[PDB]
């Protein structure tokens, strides 16, 4: 059985082979324990604050909203250790791994961002770290691989199959099925089998928590809306969670627009797939938003109306990217630029509506400068 409901309405569940059920039950039981242990709280807190740099800044952006009736704030997760929000939850999962007396972390990674995060968390906590990565993704992400290895992680390039995340990820599960007594599988987003969508949300929820206190201090009221980009859904659920019960607060999830329900990655969720049911691959200028599916809690929140989900194209994302560098001197990750592009369309399509908007700036864009350079130069 489990201690917590593994489903969000109809979505979610634990669709893994029987052999991995005791590892999921063990994690759920340990997380449930840790959530009630003051000492675990104090310890996660200490890492957050003295290691990762929390709380992070909430910055206003008047140069962008001049002349309109919008006020925009950005939640600055791009100033976290590491440059993205992923560092929050890999810290919490690394501490859980230790409470369960694990000495080893296994992870998978596409462009490398989760891989770097999992590695820095393991180096700090004294965990051995093995990271799986598709060989095609490995040849194209040389900087990130090298950053993993500087941090003492073993990166295993996966040569079989299509040699892409698919395969990296399937190999990570098979290693975890034989080594779960001593190794913890550190999933990188709010998706996958229970208990992960849950774990990940509660390890990212200080975001919206902080944002709520900050906005109350600066403006005296809650935001009209909170806007976050969605790949598997972790930064967004982490910004949305504390506001779910504040019914007047709009929750907007922004997915990549680039140029149906199924069971995969251990969960029942809406998925990108063919006619016959083989999972496809999503495409975006930003490699971080390529996720064929989405966490079950987002699927639920949509089904019931509580949050809306919209899309932004590659070009709209690049335009918001340029706007933020020029008018605020902040270079945003291209994933978070889809979120900001949506708040800029809300402002510009209705310049006399009074609206207080917070955008989650999930991470910094130094890492995208080559991508953006190569685009600017292939078009003139």
């Amino acid at each position: 059985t489990t201690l917590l409901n593994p489903y969000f309405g109809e979505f979610g569940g634990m669709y893994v082979p029987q052999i991995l059920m005791p590892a999921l039950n063990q994690l759920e039981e340990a997380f449930v324990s840790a959530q009630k242990d003051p000492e675990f709280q104090a310890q996660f807190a200490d890492l957050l604050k003295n290691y990762a740099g929390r709380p992070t800044a909430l910055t206003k952006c008047q140069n962008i909203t001049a002349g309109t009736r919008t006020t925009l704030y950005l939640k600055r997760e791009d100033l976290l250790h590491g440059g993205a929000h992923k560092t929050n939850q890999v810290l919490g999962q690394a501490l859980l791994a230790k409470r369960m007396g694990k000495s080893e972390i296994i992870a998978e990674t596409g462009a490398g961002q989760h891989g770097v995060a999992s590695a820095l968390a393991s180096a700090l906590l004294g965990l051995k770290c093995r990271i799986y990565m598709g060989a095609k993704d490995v040849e194209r992400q040389s900087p990130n691989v090298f950053r993993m290895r500087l941090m003492g992680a073993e990166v295993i390039p996966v040569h079989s199959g299509s040699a892409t995340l698919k395969d990296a990820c399937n190999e990570a599960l098979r290693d975890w099925s034989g080594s779960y007594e001593t190794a913890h599988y550190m999933l990188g987003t709010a998706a996958g089998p229970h208990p992960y969508p849950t774990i990940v949300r509660e390890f990212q929820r200080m975001i919206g928590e902080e944002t709520k206190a900050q906005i109350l201090d600066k403006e005296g009221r809650l935001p009209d809306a909170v806007i976050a980009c969605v790949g598997g859904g972790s930064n967004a659920i982490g910004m949305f969670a504390d506001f779910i019960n504040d019914t007047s607060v709009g929750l907007i999830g922004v997915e990549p627009g680039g140029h149906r329900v199924g069971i995969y990655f251990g969960m029942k969720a809406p998925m990108m797939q063919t006619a016959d049911g083989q999972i496809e691959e999503s495409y975006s200028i930003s490699a971080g938003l390529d996720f064929p599916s989405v966490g079950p809690q987002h699927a639920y929140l949509n089904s019931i109306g509580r949050a809306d989900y919209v899309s932004i194209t590659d070009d709209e994302a690049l335009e918001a990217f340029k706007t933020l560098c020029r008018h605020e001197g902040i270079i945003p990750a291209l994933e978070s630029s889809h979120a900001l592009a949506h708040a800029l369309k809300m402002m510009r399509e209705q310049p006399e509506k009074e609206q207080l908007l917070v955008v989650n700036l999930s991470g910094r864009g130094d890492k995208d400068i080559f991508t953006v350079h190569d685009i600017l130069k292939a078009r003139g």
């Binding site: 669709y15 098979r174 199924g262 069971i263």
Partner: protein, 253 residues
């Protein structure tokens, strides 16, 4: 249909275990796959276990991984897989046919509807490898409404509650993943007859399985390696399968 019951009653009358090979349908081509399967049966296979090419086989390793590739390469769809299933049955009326599947393919066009299609082509069981017993209700229910036996994996890390559920919910056979005690417990709860799978590649291991109380053994990587190794000499490949199957089946006495 009751093909598992009948095969086990028979083999018990002969004090024999079942030898059950596994292959990937359409590997390395549609027509060569049919000839391979027919060779398996002719050489003495007691039942078959079959896989359908699926984009993300998370419960699988390499020889197997490479068979799926060869499968998607030759252009095999699920649809072609079912026509194949249909003709395999039309050719062999009593051998139990078992599928090993992943959840998204059974869920895609409707659970109900996937099990209707298996019953129409004459499939006897389906194991959904990434569906644990705890989440299996809609699949077991569907299976049984269409006369299909739902199969469960009983792991080595099984505990008591697990065996009891497995006993209680599976039909046709139990998949005993590579054990004596687990075998006794299964029988004590009246579970479907256990077949031991994973890692079976030599006659001594089939005998060891029967001796321990398993009603038989499933061999998949060994078969499939014979196919890999022999892609350019179909004749020899078939000759090899035949000696291999025949010997494994002899060791089931």
């Amino acid at each position: 249909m009751e093909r598992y019951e009948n095969l086990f009653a028979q083999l018990n009358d002969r004090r024999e275990g079942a030898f059950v090979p596994f292959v990937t349908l359409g590997d390395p081509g549609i027509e060569q796959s049919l000839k391979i399967i027919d060779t398996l049966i002719d050489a003495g296979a007691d039942a078959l276990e079959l896989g359908v090419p699926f984009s993300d086989p998370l419960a699988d390793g390499p020889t197997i991984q490479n068979a799926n590739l060869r499968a998607f390469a030759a252009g095999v769809t699920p649809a072609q897989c079912f026509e194949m299933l249909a003709l395999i049955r039309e050719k062999h009326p009593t051998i139990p046919i078992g599928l090993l599947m992943y959840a998204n393919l059974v869920f895609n066009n409707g659970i109900d509807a996937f099990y209707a299609r298996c019953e129409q082509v004459g499939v006897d069981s389906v194991l959904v490898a990434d569906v644990p017993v705890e989440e299996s209700a809609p699949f077991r229910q569907a299976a049984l409404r269409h006369n299909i036996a739902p199969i469960f994996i009983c792991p080595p890390n099984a505990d008591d509650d697990l065996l009891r559920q497995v006993a209680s919910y599976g039909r046709g056979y139990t998949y005993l993943l590579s054990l004596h005690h687990l075998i006794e417990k299964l029988k004590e709860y009246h579970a479907a007859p256990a077949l031991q799978g994973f890692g079976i590649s030599s006659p001594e291991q089939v005998s060891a399985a029967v001796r321990a109380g398993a009603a038989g053994a499933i061999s998949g990587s060994a078969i499939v390696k014979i196919i890999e190794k022999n892609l350019a000499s179909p004749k020899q490949m078939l000759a090899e399968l035949r000696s291999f199957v025949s010997a494994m089946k002899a060791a089931s006495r």
